[model samples]
Target: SNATKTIHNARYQALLDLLLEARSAAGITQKELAARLGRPQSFVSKTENAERRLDVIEFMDFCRGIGTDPYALLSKLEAMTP
Candidate 1:
């Protein structure tokens, strides 16, 4: 339980930061982001608030809507972090 909790917490925090940064980088507002994803504004807001976890498909849709190519994003991230 402890390990699971810790990992989940970390993952959620990371996702929160990543989503916010990526969205901002792509010049997206919450409403605009929701429109791009075809979801309600509350969904985007909740995810940004870390109240929801994005599944793989949703994550890809987010990235695509944000105009970020997954491969390029990951490559840059790895280089920057490494």
Candidate 2:
């Protein structure tokens, strides 16, 4: 249900896109980010690929662990809206 909503929400989709960009900009491998988040690299890959679910708290942890501010991340999502 959570993943469904996120997929359906344009703002949330934008957040995922921003995260992907941030990850590329930081030059951090998926394995490295997963290690920082204490999750397996496969898990991170699955989430990024939308093969797994990422709840709000998990999303925030992921963003923060990857040197991104949760507030700024959400702000980006909000900014995607009209």
Candidate 3:
């Protein structure tokens, strides 16, 4: 549960929520997002459910998929620091 604990951290959880909010605000579903990413719907599902985690590259790709600026999102995440 060492590195795995990062997934359950408060900021990490909020980051997930922010990602979901962006997706919802864009009016896209897991299936729709999967098509844009050329990934299985399970990619969205697994990431949301925390059965899998997104590496930085995947997170950047996801930002691209959702039509958001990755650097801007990074700024949002940066403010989450304690």
Candidate order by TM-score, decreasing, is 3, 2, 1
Off by over 4 Å in 1: 71-82
lDDT of each: 0.78, 0.82, 0.87
Number of the top TM-score candidate: 3
* Tens digit of per-residue lDDT, candidate 2, span 5-54: 76576565666788899888888999999999888899889888878778
> Candidate 3 lDDT, tens digit per residue, 1-82?
5766774577777878889889998999999999999999999999987789789899999988988888898798878764
Writing each residue's lDDT as its tens digit, candidate 1 over 30-65 gives 899899889999999988887787776787788898
Please tell me which model should have the higher TM-score, number 1 or number 3. Answer: 3
Best by lDDT: 3
TM per prediction? 0.77, 0.82, 0.85
Q: Clashing residue pairs, candidate 3?
A: none
User: In model 3, which runs have C-alpha deviations exceeding 4 angstroms?
Assistant: 1-8
RMSD (Cα, Å) for all candidates, in order, is: 2.7, 3.7, 2.8
